[model samples]
Target: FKVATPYSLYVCPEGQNVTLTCRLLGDVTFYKTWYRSSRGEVQTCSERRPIRNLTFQDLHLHHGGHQAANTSHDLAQRHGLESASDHHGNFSITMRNLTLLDSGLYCCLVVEIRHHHSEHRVHGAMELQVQTGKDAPSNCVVYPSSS
Candidate 1:
């Protein structure tokens, strides 16, 4: 399976909201996971370098014709993010109450499950830039050498 997104860069002011989209472009049974990293690189799912992992489970529970969608409500609520998905394969995350620290590289991993085997890959890497209010000058120069 292949994953893709429409945009590569997003710029927003602090305290605003931004949405990052990752689309899986095939019909398959899989799990989608979102990750945030300061560095401009993609890492394996088991790596610890990424700052946060927003996982989602689209398990549809049916009880006598009633259904419910189970998502990562606790994780998303704790992180102040909204994970949106649909049958068309949209696995996007919205970052609410954006702060300067929220600016980073976001991507998604698709783990395709088959009857006898499974596979996974990472895609939809994008950069997020959060700016301070223009009227208030933040007198700080950020350098990338500290990490």
Candidate 2:
């Protein structure tokens, strides 16, 4: 089984745009959420789906956007985030105009459900460390692992 993981380190200068990808996604995975690591919800969409708006039902999979379209859905354009998928399951999100607010632990959460049922929901989390500088500072940050 393949384990989906988030990137570990990211260092960029202030105001630099950076994109962190949620890798190892699978088929039938309808949405990838770009959260602020602290659990702030960004938005969700599919590489195969186009979003018409940023709302409750709109973020879910029942919106009927899976049809063929010329332009792919771009979450960044509306939600301060840019999302893209390879149409083969690979998904990513990019945020522009990075500031000190953009510096911190960010995460991409991928939730996949089997076609048959919801008894088993497979999920993947990619943890990222985003800093705006050429060098790592002692106070940048550190996370504690239970193990």
Candidate 3:
């Protein structure tokens, strides 16, 4: 079975933009998707047909999106994830407005289409880490006085 490889970790500030990348192994037309889980709530991005790359922007207080649209519906049903086709074979996902909640595991599924037959599927996963609740350094200090 083929497997997709996960990219390195991405770090971004609040209210900023970020992009997540996933690499697929083998040659096949596949659909890429993105999903996220936050506070027990999992919201997926929009779905696209014949997807090869996925991206998200203006990421608010939502969980990081996951990629799994390549899998068959009989396997699992998740929502809010987005998918798209990459004729160039380069799959990628972009998100904006990054927040602390946008941190979790993202999966990338690759579906293989045969001649007049069912589609084959394989997948891989990646972890998203978001940092928050950090304050700026203070610049005020007092000096000692001698009388």
Candidate 4:
């Protein structure tokens, strides 16, 4: 199954909020989950409740670091992010505030509940780039240096 949404990337300055919308397609009971990717880990948001969606109130460097570590774990473990337990409505996840390290690919997944069969899943992904300070650097380089 394929999930679709508008806007594949969101650009925001540091200390600003960013929201990514996800819409489900079909008539099945489904929930939404959000994930962030890093070098080798995928951090899955543990907050799953219908009424409350995952939100990063004040973005910080650690937030990005944790997300990266967790994202790596998620990619390796293939652990699906569970949506809000009470969520029985629309499928969307929102991340508040932004940081330079928050720049990466984020994914949204939808899980379908079936009575007698296995659940069905669909997903969509988007890239977020967070900029800070005035006059963003035109050319930036990030590399692993061995000493």
Query: TM-score of every model?
Result: 0.66, 0.53, 0.50, 0.52
Which regions of candidate 3 deviate over 4 angstroms? 1-3, 6-8, 27-29, 37-84, 115-117, 135-147
Cα lDDT tens digits, model 2, 1-147, are 232444555655555666665454323334444444332365322222222233322333211124211113554455555555544445555666555655544444444444657423333343445564558443323332223
Q: Answer with 2 or 3, whichever has the higher lDDT.
A: 2
- Runs in model 1 lying further than 4 Å from the true structure: 38-70, 133-147
lDDT (10s digit) by residue, model 3, range 1-147: 465444534545556555555565552334334544222234332232221122322111121122223222322223223234343344555544555666665555555555347676554455566656475112211221112
lDDT of 2 at 31: 42
lDDT of 4 at 39: 31
Which sequence of candidate numbers ranks them by TM-score, best first? 1, 2, 4, 3
The superposed Cα distance between candidate 4 and the true structure at residue 113, in angstroms, equals: 1.5
lDDT (0 to 1) per candidate: 0.57, 0.43, 0.42, 0.45
Winning candidate number (lDDT)? 1
lDDT of 1 by residue, 1-147 (tens): 677766767767777766777675753355555666444344433332333333333211111112112245775577777665655666677777777887777665566655356555556666777877665323322222112
Candidate rank order under lDDT: 1, 4, 2, 3
Q: How accurate is candidate 1 locally (lDDT)?
A: 0.57
Residue-level lDDT of model 4, residues 1-147, one tens digit each, is 556656666666766645565554543444445666433245432332221222322111111111221223332233222223123223444344445766776666666655448677666666667767686443332222122
